[PDB]
Design a protein around this ligand. Sequence first.
Ligand SMILES: O=C(O)Cc1cc(Cl)cc(Cl)c1
Length: 167
Amino acid sequence: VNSFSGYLKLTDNVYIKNADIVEEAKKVKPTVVVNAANVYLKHGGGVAGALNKATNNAMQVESDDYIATNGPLKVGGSCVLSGHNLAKHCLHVVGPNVNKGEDIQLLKSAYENFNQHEVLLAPLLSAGIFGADPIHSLRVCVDTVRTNVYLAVFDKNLYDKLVSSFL
Ligand SMILES: O=C(O)Cc1cc(Cl)cc(Cl)c1
């Protein structure tokens, strides 16, 4: 048993809700919240900007020191950093950004990072401003992640479309 409420069950291990991931993290304080990061960990917009704003920019300060030491992530890659006031840990995962011309085939690699963690609160990778087909992202998620994932989709109309079309 865990603390996630009102999620629709899609599969054995994937659950979904129409919710703001920031508000969900603040209420649940999960062990792991996933950030939809870029390779520079520049948390300007989207999920990353919203998570970072909720940490009062402490996520960005920590991330800048991570990059100064380690250099950028890979597309498809990840790193584990603090969850600050939102979670124990934040798993920063880089899904491909179609609007930057990154390879959509790296989405599966991105979701494989989730398998290193037993339970996660996560966004729908590569959707929204990332430019990929969300229906596709949800299919890759369910076909790749084996650990327990609670997806928090912000856009209402998108949530309804994803549930109605799910195979
Ligand atoms: O939750 C959503 O509506 C989809 C989405 C996913 C990501 Cl990763 C970023 C944005 Cl801005 C939006």
